[PDB]
Amino acid sequence: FPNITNLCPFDEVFNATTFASVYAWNRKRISNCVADYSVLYNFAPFFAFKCYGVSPTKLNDLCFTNVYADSFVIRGNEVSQIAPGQTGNIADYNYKLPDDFTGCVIAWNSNKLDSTVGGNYNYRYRLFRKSKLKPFERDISTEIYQAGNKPCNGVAGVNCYFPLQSYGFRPTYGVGHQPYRVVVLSFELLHAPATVCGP
Amino acid sequence: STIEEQAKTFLDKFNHEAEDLFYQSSLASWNYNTNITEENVQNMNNAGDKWSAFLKEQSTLAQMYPLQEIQNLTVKLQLQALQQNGSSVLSEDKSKRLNTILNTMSTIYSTGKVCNPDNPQECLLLEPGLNEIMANSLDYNERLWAWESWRSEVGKQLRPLYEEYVVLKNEMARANHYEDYGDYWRGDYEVNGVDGYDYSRGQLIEDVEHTFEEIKPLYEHLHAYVRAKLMNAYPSYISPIGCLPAHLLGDMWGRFWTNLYSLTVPFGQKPNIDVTDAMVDQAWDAQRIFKEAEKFFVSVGLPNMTQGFWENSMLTDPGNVQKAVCHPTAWDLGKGDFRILMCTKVTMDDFLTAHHEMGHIQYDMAYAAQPFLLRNGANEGFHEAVGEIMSLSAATPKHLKSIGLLSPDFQEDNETEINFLLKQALTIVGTLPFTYMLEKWRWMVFKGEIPKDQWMKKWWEMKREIVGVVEPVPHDETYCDPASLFHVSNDYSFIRYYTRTLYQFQFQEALCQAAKHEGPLHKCDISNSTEAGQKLFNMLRLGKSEPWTLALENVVGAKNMNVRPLLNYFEPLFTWLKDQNKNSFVGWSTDWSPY
Ligand SMILES: *[C@@H]1O[C@H](CO)[C@@H](O[C@@H]2O[C@H](CO)[C@@H](O[C@@H]3O[C@H](CO[C@H]4O[C@H](CO[C@H]5O[C@H](CO)[C@@H](O)[C@H](O)[C@@H]5O)[C@@H](O)[C@H](O[C@H]5O[C@H](CO)[C@@H](O)[C@H](O)[C@@H]5O)[C@@H]4O)[C@@H](O)[C@H](O[C@H]4O[C@H](CO)[C@@H](O)[C@H](O)[C@@H]4O)[C@@H]3O)[C@H](O)[C@H]2NC(C)=O)[C@H](O)[C@H]1NC(C)=O
Ligand SMILES: *[C@@H]1O[C@H](CO)[C@@H](O[C@@H]2O[C@H](CO)[C@@H](O[C@@H]3O[C@H](CO)[C@@H](O)[C@H](O)[C@@H]3O)[C@H](O)[C@H]2NC(C)=O)[C@H](O)[C@H]1NC(C)=O
Ligand SMILES: *[C@@H]1O[C@H](CO)[C@@H](O[C@@H]2O[C@H](CO)[C@@H](O[C@@H]3O[C@H](CO)[C@@H](O)[C@H](O)[C@@H]3O)[C@H](O)[C@H]2NC(C)=O)[C@H](O)[C@H]1NC(C)=O
Ligand SMILES: *[C@@H]1O[C@H](CO)[C@@H](O[C@@H]2O[C@H](CO)[C@@H](O[C@@H]3O[C@H](CO)[C@@H](O)[C@H](O)[C@@H]3O)[C@H](O)[C@H]2NC(C)=O)[C@H](O)[C@H]1NC(C)=O
Ligand SMILES: *[C@@H]1O[C@H](CO)[C@@H](O[C@@H]2O[C@H](CO)[C@@H](O)[C@H](O)[C@H]2NC(C)=O)[C@H](O)[C@H]1NC(C)=O
Ligand SMILES: *[C@@H]1O[C@H](CO)[C@@H](O)[C@H](O)[C@H]1NC(C)=O
Ligand SMILES: [Zn+2]
């Protein structure tokens, strides 16, 4: 097998035709490739490009042992919760970032992609959970949340709710309720040979 | 788990399902109102049936949580609002019949056409055609023809529908434990469980009837003044003692006397006009009207209109491709979707109505922060008054001079201020007896007080008695003339426009103190006062979370509606009208009628 370097598959994540629900968020491990973060631009107007602990302008001169790209879709007014030190339905039960997060959060409006006149109920999120999510934890359990004191026996009903909630994105919604595609780049530096570098 | 934590979790799950169903029902209703088709009707029916069957089960489930152990008040409020007299359980057969009556009356009003007796192809609708004749014509015969043709062809069409409309609306109200549909609408103002701030359904009838009696003197003098200036315009058609013919009043029903200004200006020639002409001269657009209204709300700290508002609203007549309900309305569909539906012409009437409807939307946006069940105005009067306290400021010559519709050097002498106060009186004061009588007739018809065989004998007995306006043609009981108004045939409560008219001058008085205005109220313009907008916004953001008595007392200092500020606003005109009716008669007798 030959010594040839790959070009980092950032197009597989940022340009996926369908993103995951935030409760079941995708993670792609980027490794053993040359990353060119210079292609990450020209998203929907007034997108968010929010980095923490690393400068995105120096990114093309840095090396890391691994890079992780987590992707999902959320509501417009939930975007602020995808950052360190945040509370809310998303940061508490669906996707959590730690205080020492070193990485970037790219989030852009996807109303033209993910909204439907009949409503897009495919994108969902967890509305009830017994406790807060640990950072980078993923929960995909469809177990009936028991709000009351009677057991639910896996049946939705009085005080027994199905824990996931569909967004139902429609294009005529306001921006706070419109869908936003989100990609979370995590740059990891370990005691190991750095295998993701810029040009 | 405590009952409160369970009630919270129930309300959370409720709000996410309710917002999605409310949006579908709202959007279905929008599609019908902008575009009247048989397919859009049954879509509105299906989305409305799903929405009520949802409330049917949710209001039942909400009984499982007793209020007496909810310590968090805002949780208590959502629970109360969900089990409260909104069951609207009707049988499937009777629920479908009331909808057919409602949809038919709705379709007839907006698509009703009077056609040439000799040429069936050329017809006039109410909105583009007949309104122009009733607002701009000066021929006695032409106005009479339009007044009668609309009430004879469309009015008679609505008479049998309205009779069965009340027998079903009354049956619905009784199943929800009200005396009648009129008591149901009155329940909008009801407040109980709050010491000193409570307000009953019956207390509105007393407060409207007594506040209106304090209004009788001011309106009777304006009535006599308009009578004299109308005597000049029309040779032998009006006597100095009789009522005012109903087809000469400025619009289709005489709801406002605003278009009578051209005939009644006290000082008309020498003071520059305060009306539409300069808009047309400056080639103003329906977009310019709303952009100027948007500019006004922003100047007090309120937000812009959303991007979706401009993309999704219908702000001009769509044409003959679709049949639209052209009457100006404001829409809060939820999910950040705000729209106005209005067939905007380039008039000063439409310019001020833009401020009215945008006032609704600004209220909707302000209390969007509330829980779903509390997103509404304090009462219907509050909602219909927000745009009016801005219209008060935008109508003043100070503001029109600063937005370029009056000369850059305007002479604001003693005389131009009386012109302003009169035109303000033609609209605001003129609509008060019209409003009170119409709603009182509905209440009296909803209640068992006006039988079928004399529905129009009493409607005109109350027009001549209370309003001072007489039928030019005798109408038998085949006619239904109140239903020829948008709000009556479209199932809207009308007393909202009476209570708001007192509310606005109360609010405007408090807001002009916030902006440190110096003179009498009618010179006040709150345009660039971000402090005045702050006082207003701190109430708009509340929604239905506080009773209207407390929300009103925390801004104006009065737990109730009051007539004082309205009368201070019009005092210079009140003492001026007295001087003009020296050799005239103030009042009228019911014993005179053309035919
Ligand atoms: C009656 O009950 C209600 C509800 O039970 C209660 O209101 C709650 O009060 C608690 C206070 O402990 C609030 O929790 C705090 O929230 C802080 C952040 O607030 C923002 O985010 C909230 C949730 O995020 C939502 O936002 C997005 C859009 O922004 C939305 O799509 C999602 O729903 C998402 O979940 C949001 O509710 C909140 O808005 C409320 O609060 C503001 C503030 O006044 C108000 O103006 C609004 O009108 C609205 O009522 C706001 O947008 C957060 O910083 C804080 O974090 C502390 O606690 C956590 C957990 O212990 C710690 O980890 C953290 O380090 C901090 O110490 C805390 O979580 C909760 O949000 C309120 N919920 C609601 C529905 O209002 C009332 O207080 C009760 N009344 C009385 C008298 O007790
Ligand atoms: C996701 O897909 C889009 C669409 O292909 C990618 O955008 C394209 O990326 C290339 C590479 O930088 C850019 O092309 C540029 O075109 C301009 C002229 O328009 C030219 O002057 C430049 O030299 C460059 O060739 C541009 O950003 C864009 N091209 C398009 C849209 O035509 C995007 O890179 C993909 N995302 C990822 C992460 O791969
Ligand atoms: C005014 O309202 C009418 C409703 O009667 C709209 O016409 C209908 O609009 C729907 C919604 O897009 C469409 O139905 C479509 O039917 C076709 C053929 O059966 C099919 O592809 C789908 O079943 C789809 O639902 C269609 O445009 C039309 N249906 C009719 C006429 O039967 C009309 O679009 C509205 N006007 C405006 C300007 O919005
Ligand atoms: C609320 O505040 C705005 C902004 O301060 C006021 O608009 C300003 O109006 C003055 C007077 O018209 C403008 O000054 C001068 O106007 C003449 C028109 O004859 C023209 O040569 C220039 O525009 C000149 O500056 C000023 O420009 C204008 N400012 C802006 C930003 O448009 C407005 O009059 C205030 N409204 C009230 C009711 O106080
Ligand atoms: C309200 O909207 C107007 C335009 O609709 C804003 O004015 C524009 O602001 C942008 C960026 O601030 C600039 O291009 C110009 O200053 C304005 N453009 C035009 C065409 O008028 C205004 O800033 C908005 N105000 C608020 C409070 O949202
Ligand atoms: C005009 O001013 C005179 C005195 O300056 C006053 O008597 C008169 O009432 C004023 N007219 C109007 C219409 O205000
Ligand atoms: Zn209104």
Coordinates of N, CA, C and O and ligand atoms in Angstrom, one line a residue, chain B residues 399 402 408 525 527-528, ligand 4:
Chain B
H399 N -46.6 65.6 12.2 CA -46.0 64.4 11.6 C -46.1 64.4 10.1 O -45.1 64.1 9.4
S402 N -43.4 66.4 8.7 CA -42.1 65.8 8.8 C -41.9 64.6 7.9 O -40.7 64.2 7.7
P408 N -43.1 72.0 3.4 CA -42.0 72.1 4.4 C -42.1 73.3 5.3 O -41.3 73.3 6.3
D525 N -47.2 64.2 19.3 CA -46.6 63.2 18.3 C -45.5 62.5 19.0 O -44.4 63.1 19.3
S527 N -43.4 60.3 17.9 CA -42.7 59.6 16.9 C -41.3 59.1 17.4 O -41.1 57.9 17.4
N528 N -40.5 60.0 17.8 CA -39.1 59.7 18.1 C -38.8 59.4 19.6 O -37.7 59.4 20.0
Ligands
LIG4 C1 -37.9 62.0 14.0 O1 -36.5 61.9 13.8 C2 -36.1 62.0 12.4 C3 -34.6 61.8 12.4 O2 -34.0 62.8 13.2 C4 -36.6 63.3 11.8 O3 -36.2 63.3 10.4 C5 -35.5 64.5 10.1 O4 -36.3 65.6 9.7 C6 -35.6 66.8 9.4 C7 -36.6 67.8 9.0 O5 -37.3 67.4 7.9 C8 -34.5 66.6 8.3 O6 -33.7 67.7 8.3 C9 -33.7 68.4 7.0 O7 -34.9 68.1 6.2 C10 -34.9 68.8 5.0 C11 -36.3 68.7 4.4 O8 -36.8 70.0 4.1 C12 -33.8 68.2 4.0 O9 -33.2 69.2 3.3 C13 -32.8 67.4 4.8 O10 -33.3 66.0 5.0 C14 -32.4 68.0 6.2 O11 -31.6 67.1 6.9 C15 -33.6 65.4 8.7 O12 -32.8 65.1 7.6 C16 -34.5 64.2 9.0 N1 -33.6 63.0 9.4 C17 -33.7 61.8 8.9 C18 -32.7 60.8 9.4 O13 -34.4 61.6 7.9 C19 -38.1 63.4 11.9 O14 -38.6 64.6 11.4 C20 -38.5 63.2 13.4 N2 -40.0 63.2 13.5 C21 -40.6 63.9 14.4 C22 -42.1 63.8 14.4 O15 -40.1 64.6 15.3

